[PDB]
């Protein structure tokens, strides 16, 4: 008659690492790291992401004429931008504070597109024929859908034009405008006129004035001229006064902006968007797990496990497995 | 450190005990069998579960990198942002990877200590009524039936009850 | 005869947390985290903080006429700014590099207020009558006490005016100036004159030039015109040359600046400043403790315990308490 | 890592021993009483004091957030500063909270080991001159006065001195 | 915690045992000597080597500060960069210094456990065939030759072989 | 007959610290922290660093005439600038985005110096006599070797001058230019002329235009005038158009640029550069070690141990040393 004290053993071949010894077989363990992903984009919080498709972010928000598929109100859980999108800023020039613009929009939830200044705002001028071959739609010349290129009538001078927008809404307004820099004095006199010309934009918190800098630049899309693009935020209760005697690329349509109450994301990716739902969406794909860590990507939206470089993080729960 | 029981003076484990981590094997006139000690096993489960849950809970925040963009004249704050993102990545990678190494050790040693304590608990009841074989087994100096075995496992073993039968078997040998 | 080995027990109900078990009653323990604060501001290093009262930081250093209580020498341990102080930049406009200025002042300990350019510096112009109802002193209209608004005599033209300050002291000088932007050309010609006008400042290390940007703006404090405010640091041994033919808001009074040899602070708070002393001053109040951690605030100046999110950090010192 | 003594084979503590963490309770003709072992107790006190001080000492730096301000056109570096400040806050919170959990375990286990070792220390001297009750107590097979008691705690117990008297009293009580 | 052996019931170490960390000193008619315990010494070396290597390997990344410069109007991002660089410096200093304190404790205790376990391994075989002096030494109740000593080290000591001879010595 | 179990002891007096006890003597231990350095600079990956010697980074890359020894092709593993180098920006003025320039070059490996616009590019103007005593070479006045100071012909006006460079190589081109700001209107008329003057640079991705800002400034290096220096990167396949009617400091020589595929470094130090080899090179010197940590410097190039503040980090390997 005898009694023995002993411990459990089983058929586990699962191994963990310890400080004193590596690859130790244990009876029970739990994996904390997730390395599996679905390579695709799904919906976050029952909201579809915005695919910018063949348009860049600037091309979308400025209304590049080939971006018509996007020309509407937009509500996104997040934004997917495609690496090689062809439709950007079609007419050559710099958008001032471009990176800050992307950060603002990325921090957004929804934008509502509306007409800020109708063509009837600007009187004594040609509101048509504001197009260029640099911004083609099909073969024919066109222009941005959120901007109005105003040129002088062939008959008269370019009169002082004025516009006013009082933001009486509760929502901030994102709007855009520009200053045209024709390549030669010929075009400046033909499009707007001689003498000192000006573009004047202002609100309670902003004062903007510029004059044309006439210069011949290397050709981009057949253009030696340039447009300096600008963007700004008209706060609720603020009012915008526009004053110009020439070279104004006027705000036409603008956006009422809705701040996202959490972190937003803009993903640069080739992955397909499908009809699916996700709690955790990374730029590399969807993660579905109850695990604590993940091997997929540092860039994500929603509720994701912590990103680490580890290939495995396995906690021992059971004991050293010693079968007989 | 090692408590000397697991893969120690108890040379191996039992694939025949499937209901618990720590337990007993008995032999008598009524046959043999394995039985898990449910008290010490459950207490271990509660402790390990708590350890795992507590670790997960302290890991329950995330440093979140962002996809913000920087111009060619923003190289410094770009590089700054990257060194920060890599900075916290390396800290949390270190913390996670090292915590797992150290605590896996602690967890394995914990099981060792539990087996050891369980072995001494039994050794203390039997005293000289049983022969300590040094391998984790005890040879009884008296007949120990199923109920007798239960009392040892359940921890209610009556020592003076079997003492005389035990000593007379040590006397005759 | 017997002897027993055993361990201490007491009447303690104090509990600590362990990795294997929560709520463990122990015989002795120590709390490492401090949650207590005195909601008030005290002196750091026996030097009183500066209460900005009803003035904003910009309103103070620019010398808003309603900030008169603050226009003097100041030496502070730290600065307290009140959330809703009404007296800011009274005449509408942008302070250029405003946030860097706030950062500079926060890193300072003392300023000495002195008259840099007396009114007699600018001759052939009206150095009086440079006041506005947007910047009232008492009930009457006025202007900043560190700035001089120069307007043209109608008798003569606006002459090219010049001023010079050679900084021969050991202390750096913080000074301010501005460019006035009238709402309409009428006022520009009336206040300064026709043609291109300019404001030019220069030192050994700085070169500054601007022209008036005339624009029609929404009224702020009864003013549709604007002033672009600027600030700079005249290093010891450096010299400032001022040259302008119009639209100049000239430096009048400035500050000799003393850099703090350690971290300075600017707190946004409603808390009372009282007659007391502190080693650790947070933005949420005073901490008096020997403890290692605190959950009160991340923002503080003196010698404070490390900030964490924890509700409690209690170390076991004694053993598991098991009374019989 | 439990050493099996505290809330172990020694089932409970003594509220009657107030001068130390670990100690003795004796019984003889001269009466009973509690006495702390000052050696093992003092050594533990030094160690725990040292642990706490060392922890405090390594926690003796601070990440200090600042109240710098950023414009509406500085959104990126504003968020950068914010994610950094929250970054170290989460790191130090992690470090602090987890360390308290882990080391509280170690400290409690340490006391357990001290009680166990003190117990083995006594058991080693008494050998078969005393009856191990398994609960942390030893019944002497011989008469042990106060001077005898002192030697046990102090570790100078004379085993062969009591050997003969003890062996006759194990024989006399057994029925063989 | 302490396992009670090192500077414990074994009061001191042996300067005479140079081939290992843990071991034996034996005495009989065939002479005397120190001998390292071959099993436990190697296993300890393997574990500690692993511990040291594992620690080094987890410390095998570096936060690298840069010598980038900032203008007088960049004071905020300058200070941002400094607080970050000092931030990680303080984090890694904390980690390194505290890890050394905690693991040095563990390493010393590891040896203690190894010595205690080595002592119980021997105590368990000899049983009542030997007299436990409590200081880490065992006096044999029978003649124990060199091969007998070796059997103890191998952990193969034959208890019933010497059982009767030991027991008969009762004065 | 007897056998004893025991443990190793020796003559080691080496101590370590534990959580429970300090100054603990152990039989074996390893030091993980390295405090030793060779105070000098060596080769990284068998490639020598660039010694800027008596020239500042700006003085070198702009081509200060006293930096001639460095005006050639250069290939560096890293760059060393000496604290008090005399040859800097000799003609007083600001280098725009200077810190971004230093950061870019630090991220570089090699520059190839070539002539972008030869003096014959600019027609109708004086390309000689473009020198100043502020930038002396020997006793005679001189100017930068990468810049051309263009002044009006004595006989004719300053014509609109143009230049074009098409970058057909695979490597980006680093180039520099400037705008001269005379102290008084007199010199402006004498060197360039009256009326509106401009300096205009443009590429497919860049638009630059400036005007002269005439102002009286304190003398620096005997000059009350200033030059605003600018730098930019001509991308492969891009084209630079230069257009100016005056005040132009023209690009002359530029650099073909090679981007470093890893982090580069710029050390500001007095330490000697030698022909030697290092795996780890810090700004304070070379570290040669197998150790895991170092207290020497946070700033380095190559593969270095982790930087900490610790004086010592010693791990116990052996046991507590307890001789008989
Ligand atoms: C640890 O070991 C012993 C524990 O008691 C102590 O040694 C005994 O201490 C006695 C008490 O002081 C000593 O007293 C001697 O004997 C009688 C007491 O019976 C005294 O009156 C005498 O003055 C004194 N000397 C003589 C010659 O009688 C004894 O020396 C001793 N007894 C025995 C049997 O050894 C140690 O002192 C103690 N160490 C401490 C407390 O530090
Ligand atoms: C979280 O998920 C894990 C793994 O996805 C689950 O793990 C299991 O725990 C149960 C406990 O009874 C075991 O029976 C399973 O065998 C475990 N899974 C594996 C793969 O071994 C776990 O169920 C989930 N969390 C909870 C609380 O149940
Ligand atoms: C640990 O101790 C805490 C003491 O606050 C216990 O907290 C109580 O638990 C109940 C539910 O069990 C909850 O209402 C609150 O969390 C607490 N109630 C109070 C303070 O009235 C907790 O239950 C204990 N056990 C754990 C956390 O497992
Ligand atoms: C030393 O110990 C080993 C085992 O640890 C002994 O080898 C064993 O010998 C027995 C026969 O008595 C076999 O049944 C085992 O299978 C052997 N073990 C192995 C691992 O092969 C060895 O004989 C011992 N040496 C001495 C001199 O006694
Ligand atoms: C760095 O290299 C040295 C070799 O010079 C290592 O030190 C040796 O380690 C062996 C193995 O324990 C000893 O036998 C030698 O006596 C040691 N030589 C010394 C200390 O000079 C050292 O361990 C290495 N360090 C690291 C961190 O890898
Ligand atoms: C191991 O044995 C168990 C019990 O029968 C069962 O899960 C299965 O047979 C084996 N497990 C695996 C994963 O093969
Ligand atoms: C331990 O880890 C894995 C086991 O799956 C293996 O890749 C690795 O090579 C092992 N290490 C050694 C030293 O065998
Ligand atoms: C805009 O409308 C509001 C109505 O609330 C009015 O009070 C305000 O004066 C208007 N702004 C301007 C510039 O007229
Ligand atoms: C008893 O306990 C109370 C609280 O539980 C404590 O404040 C007190 O100091 C303890 N000792 C006494 C009352 O002697
Ligand atoms: C004033 O500046 C001039 C140089 O413009 C020079 O004499 C000196 O730096 C200053 N004067 C004195 C007396 O220090
Ligand atoms: C150090 O080693 C020497 C030589 O083996 C020996 O005397 C002793 O172990 C130590 N020396 C002293 C003076 O303690
Ligand atoms: C340990 O060694 C040095 C000796 O100066 C110092 O750190 C300290 O005084 C010593 N003692 C302790 C307890 O640290
Ligand atoms: C630059 O040169 C290339 C020659 O390979 C030519 O194809 C391209 O059109 C040129 N770009 C110009 C002239 O703008």
> What are residue C163's DSSP bridge partners?
C242
What lies within 8 Å, CB to CB, of A29 at 6+ separation is A14, A16, A314, A315, A316, A317, A318
Q: What angle do CA F16, F19, F24 make, to 5 degrees?
A: 30
> Which of C165, C205, C207 would best serve as a mutation to test chain F binding (most F beta carbons within 10 A)?
C207
Token readout for F231 is: 């730098």
Local structure of A250: helix, strand or coil: strand
Q: Cα(A147)–Cα(C11) distance, rounded to whole angstroms?
A: 79
- Residue F145: count of CB within 10 angstroms of its CB: 17
Q: Is A97 exposed, middle or buried (0-12, 13-18, 19+ CB in 10 A)?
A: middle
Name residue, tokens 């008259």.
C115
Query: Are F122 and F82 a contacting pair, CB within 8 Å?
Result: no
Nearest bound ligand to CA E155?
4
Query: Are A225 and A90 a contacting pair, CB within 8 Å?
Result: no
What lies within 8 Å, CB to CB, of A270 at 6+ separation is A82, A83
A219 CA closest ligand 13 atom index = 14
Query: Are D98 and C18 a contacting pair, CB within 8 Å?
Result: no
For residue A121, the 8-state DSSP code is G
E147 CA closest ligand 4 atom index = 27
Q: Cα(F238)–Cα(E73) distance, rounded to whole angstroms?
A: 32
Q: Cα(B9)–Cα(B3) distance, rounded to whole angstroms?
A: 10
Q: Cα(A322)–Cα(B11) distance, rounded to whole angstroms?
A: 8
Q: Cα(B41)–Cα(B106) distance, rounded to whole angstroms?
A: 17
DSSP characters over chain D: ---STBTTTB---BTT--S-SEEEEEEETTEEEEEE-HHHHHHHHHHHHHHHHHHHHHT------------TT-HHHHHHHHHHHHHHHHHHHHHHHHHHHHHHHHHHHHHHHHHHHHHHHHHHHHGGGEEE-SSSEEEESS---HHHHHHHHHT---HHHHHHHHHHHHHHH---
Q: Is A133 exposed, middle or buried (0-12, 13-18, 19+ CB in 10 A)?
A: middle
User: How long a stretch of residues is chain D?
Assistant: 176
CATH assignment of the domain containing C22:
2.10.77.10
Token readout for F83 is: 């604290």
Report strand pairing: C239-244 vs C74-75. Answer: unpaired
Q: From the CA of D54, how far away is ligand 6's center (Å)?
A: 48
What lies within 8 Å, CB to CB, of E29 at 6+ separation is E143, E145, F1
> Residues lining ligand 12, CB < 6 A?
F 22-23
What lies within 8 Å, CB to CB, of E54 at 6+ separation is A19, B101
Token readout for A243 is: 């004053």
F81-84 long-range contacts (CB < 8 A, ≥24 apart) are F81/F52, F81/F56, F81/F57, F81/F266, F81/F267, F81/F268, F81/F269, F82/F52, F82/F53, F82/F54, F82/F268, F82/F269, F82/F270, F83/F268, F83/F269, F83/F270
Report strand pairing: F280-282 vs F273-278. Answer: unpaired
- Kindly identify which residue of chain D lies nearest to residue C312, measuring between CA atoms: D97
Name residue, tokens 């650099």.
F255
**Ligand 8 and A239: CB distance under 6 A:** yes
Q: Which of F174, F192, F180 is nearest to F91 (CA)?
A: F180
Local structure of C123: helix, strand or coil: coil
For residue A290, the 8-state DSSP code is S
**Ligand 1 and D154: CB distance under 6 A:** yes
For residue A214, the 8-state DSSP code is -
**Ligand 3 and C22: CB distance under 6 A:** yes
Token readout for C249 is: 């808001």
Strand order in the sheet with A306-307: A33-34, A293-294, A306-307
Considering CB atoms only, which of D21, D65, D100 is closest to C313? D100
Kindly determine whether residue E75 and residue C107, on different chains, have CB atoms separated by under 8 Å.
yes
Query: Are A204 and A239 a contacting pair, CB within 8 Å?
Result: yes
Q: Is A296 exposed, middle or buried (0-12, 13-18, 19+ CB in 10 A)?
A: buried
The minimum CA-CA distance between C40 and chain F, rounded to whole Å, is 36
Name residue, tokens 């400290």.
D107
Kindly determine whether residue C103 and residue E73, on different chains, have CB atoms separated by under 8 Å.
no
Which of C274, C295, C313 terminates a domain? The answer is C274
Q: Cα(C24)–Cα(C1) distance, rounded to whole angstroms?
A: 35
- Both F137 and F285 in one domain: the answer is no
The minimum CA-CA distance between E140 and chain D, rounded to whole Å, is 17
Range 4-23 of E in CB contact (< 8 A) with F: 5-7, 10-15, 17-18, 20-23
Q: From the CA of C9, how far away is ligand 9's center (Å)?
A: 13
Q: Which of A149, A210, C229 is nearest to F209 (CA)?
A: A210
- Both C3 and C110 in one domain: the answer is no
Q: What angle do CA A285, A288, A293 make, to 5 degrees?
A: 90
A162: contact with C, CB 8 A cutoff: yes
- Both C161 and C290 in one domain: the answer is no
> Residues lining ligand 11, CB < 6 A?
E 15; F 11
Structural domains of chain F, count: 2
| Phi, psi values for residue D164, rounded to 5° | -70, -45
| Phi, psi values for residue F60, rounded to 5° | -70, -55
- Both C7 and C62 in one domain: the answer is no
Q: Domain span at residue B99?
A: 1-173
DSSP characters over E2-32: --STBTTTB---BTT--S-SEEEEEEETTEE
Q: Which of A248, A244, A206 is nearest to A228 (CA)?
A: A248
Local structure of B101: helix, strand or coil: helix
What lies within 8 Å, CB to CB, of A159 at 6+ separation is A123, A124, A125, A245
H-run or E-run covering B81: helix B75-126
CATH assignment of the domain containing C171:
3.90.209.20
- Both F252 and F143 in one domain: the answer is yes
The minimum CA-CA distance between B130 and chain F, rounded to whole Å, is 27
Token readout for A82 is: 């495609």
Q: Cα(C48)–Cα(C276) distance, rounded to whole angstroms?
A: 9
Q: Domain span at residue C317?
A: 1-41+275-324
F30 CA closest ligand 5 atom index = 23
- Both F83 and F211 in one domain: the answer is yes
Q: Cα(A319)–Cα(C219) distance, rounded to whole angstroms?
A: 77
Q: From the CA of A179, how far away is ligand 8's center (Å)?
A: 28
Q: What angle do CA C238, C75, C135 make, to 5 degrees?
A: 80
Q: Cα(D36)–Cα(D25) distance, rounded to whole angstroms?
A: 9
**Ligand 7 and A311: CB distance under 6 A:** no
- Kindly identify which residue of chain B lies nearest to residue F104, measuring between CA atoms: B75
Token readout for B113 is: 């200590």
Q: Cα(E121)–Cα(E117) distance, rounded to whole angstroms?
A: 6
Burial E106-120 (b: 16+ CB within 10 A, else e): bbbbbbbbbbbbbbb
User: How long a stretch of residues is chain F?
Assistant: 324
Query: Are A180 and A213 a contacting pair, CB within 8 Å?
Result: no
What lies within 8 Å, CB to CB, of D50 at 6+ separation is F19, F20, F21, F22
- Kindly identify which residue of chain C lies nearest to residue A199, measuring between CA atoms: C215
Q: From the CA of E137, how far away is ligand 2's center (Å)?
A: 50
Q: Which of C236, C293, C322, C311 is nearest to C7 (CA)?
A: C322
**Ligand 7 and A22: CB distance under 6 A:** yes
Q: Cα(E19)–Cα(C163) distance, rounded to whole angstroms?
A: 89
DSSP characters over C30-88: EE-EE---BSSEEEETTBPPEE-TTB-HHHHHHT-GGGGGG-S-EE-SSEEE-TT--BS
- Both C133 and C3 in one domain: the answer is no
H-run or E-run covering E89: helix E75-126
- Both C321 and C290 in one domain: the answer is yes
Q: Cα(F105)–Cα(F233) distance, rounded to whole angstroms?
A: 11
What lies within 8 Å, CB to CB, of A267 at 6+ separation is A41, A78, A79, A80, A81, A283, A299, B67
DSSP characters over B122-139: HHHHHGGGEEE-SSSEEE
Q: Cα(B47)–Cα(B64) distance, rounded to whole angstroms?
A: 32
> Which of B1, B94, B115 would best serve as a mutation to test chain E binding (most E beta carbons within 10 A)?
B1
Structural domains of chain B, count: 1
Tell me what percent of chain F is helix, strand and coil, each rounded to the nearest 5. 10, 40, 50
Range 74-93 of B in CB contact (< 8 A) with A: 74, 85, 89-90, 92-93
- Both C109 and C24 in one domain: the answer is no
Query: Are F150 and F193 a contacting pair, CB within 8 Å?
Result: no
F10 CA closest ligand 11 atom index = 9
Q: Which of F264, F266, F200, F201 is nearest to F232 (CA)?
A: F201
Categorise residue C26: left if φ over 0, alpha if ψ from -120 to 50, beta otherwise.
Answer: beta
Query: Are D50 and F19 a contacting pair, CB within 8 Å?
Result: yes
Q: Cα(B112)–Cα(A5) distance, rounded to whole angstroms?
A: 12
Q: Cα(D138)–Cα(D129) distance, rounded to whole angstroms?
A: 9
- Both C19 and C74 in one domain: the answer is no
- Residue F324: count of CB within 10 angstroms of its CB: 10
Expressed in Å, this structure's resolution amounts to 2.7
CATH assignment of the domain containing E32:
3.90.20.10
Query: Are A95 and A231 a contacting pair, CB within 8 Å?
Result: yes
Token readout for C286 is: 């005073």
- Both C222 and C105 in one domain: the answer is yes
Kindly determine whether residue E8 and residue D61, on different chains, have CB atoms separated by under 8 Å.
no
Q: Cα(F239)–Cα(F271) distance, rounded to whole angstroms?
A: 42
Q: Which residues of E touch F308 (CB under 8 A)?
A: 89, 92-93, 96-97
Query: Are F291 and E81 a contacting pair, CB within 8 Å?
Result: no
Residue to mutate (ligand 13; options A216, A218, A220, A223; most atoms within 8 A of CB) = A218
Q: Cα(C135)–Cα(C151) distance, rounded to whole angstroms?
A: 16
Distances C261 to C40, C99, C265 between C-alpha atoms, Å: 25, 21, 12
Q: From the CA of A237, how far away is ligand 8's center (Å)?
A: 7
H-run or E-run covering B39: helix B38-58
- Both F195 and F245 in one domain: the answer is yes
Orientation of helix D75-126 relative to helix D146-154, angle to 10°:
140
């Amino acid at each position: 008659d005898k009694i023995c004290i002993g411990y459990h053993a089983n058929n586990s071949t699962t191994k963990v690492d310890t400080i004193l010894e590596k690859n130790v077989t244990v009876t029970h363990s739990v994996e904390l790291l997730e390395n599996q992903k679905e390579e695709r984009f799904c919906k976050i919080s029952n909201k579809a992401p915005l695919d910018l498709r063949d348009c860049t972010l600037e091309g979308w928000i400025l209304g590049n004429p080939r971006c018509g598929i996007l020309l509407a109100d937009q509500s996104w859980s997040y934004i997917v931008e495609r690496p090689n999108a062809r439709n950007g800023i079609c007419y050559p020039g710099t958008l001032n504070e471009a990176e800050e613009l992307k950060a603002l929009i990325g921090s957004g939830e929804r934008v509502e597109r509306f007409e800020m200044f109708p063509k009837s705002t600007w009187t004594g001028v040609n509101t048509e024929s504001g197009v260029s071959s640099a911004c083609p739609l099909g073969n024919g010349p066109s222009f941005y859908r959120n901007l109005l290129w105003i040129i002088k009538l062939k008959s008269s001078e370019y009169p002082v034009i004025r516009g006013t927008f009082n933001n009486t809404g509760d929502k901030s307004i994102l709007y855009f405008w520009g200053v045209h820099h024709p390549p030669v004095t010929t075009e400046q006199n033909a499009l707007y006129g001689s003498g000192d010309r000006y573009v004047r934009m202002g609100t309670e918190s902003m004062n903007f004035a510029r004059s044309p800098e006439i210069a011949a630049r290397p050709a981009v899309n057949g253009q030696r001229g340039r447009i300096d693009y600008f963007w700004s935020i008209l706060k609720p209760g603020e009012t915008l006064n526009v004053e110009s005697n020439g070279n104004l690329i006027a705000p036409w349509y603008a956006y009422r902006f809705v701040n996202k109450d959490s972190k937003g994301a803009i993903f640069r990716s080739n992955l397909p968007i499908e009809n699916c739902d996700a709690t955790c969406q990374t730029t590399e794909g969807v993660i579905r797990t109850n695990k604590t860590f993940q091997n997929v990507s540092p860039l994500w939206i929603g509720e994701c496990p912590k990103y680490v470089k580890s290939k495995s993080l396995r906690l021992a729960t059971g004991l050293r497995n010693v079968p007989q | 450190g090692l408590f000397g029981a697991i893969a120690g003076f108890i040379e191996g484990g039992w694939t025949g005990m499937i209901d618990g981590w720590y337990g007993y094997h008995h032999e008598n006139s009524q046959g043999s069998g394995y039985a898990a000690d449910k008290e010490s096993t459950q207490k271990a489960i509660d402790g390990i579960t708590n350890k795992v849950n507590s670790i997960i809970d302290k890991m329950n925040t995330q440093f979140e990198a962002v996809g913000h963009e920087f111009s060619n004249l923003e190289r410094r704050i770009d590089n700054l942002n990257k060194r920060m993102e890599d900075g916290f990545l390396d800290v949390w990678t270190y913390n996670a990877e090292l915590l797992v190494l150290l605590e896996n050790e602690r967890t394995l040693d914990l099981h060792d200590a539990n087996v050891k304590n369980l072995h001494e608990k039994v050794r203390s009841q039997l005293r000289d009524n049983a022969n300590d074989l040094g391998n984790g087994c005890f040879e009884f100096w008296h007949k120990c039936n199923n109920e007798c075995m239960e009392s040892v496992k359940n921890g209610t073993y009556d020592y003076p009850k079997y003492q005389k039968e035990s000593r007379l078997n040590r006397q005759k040998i």
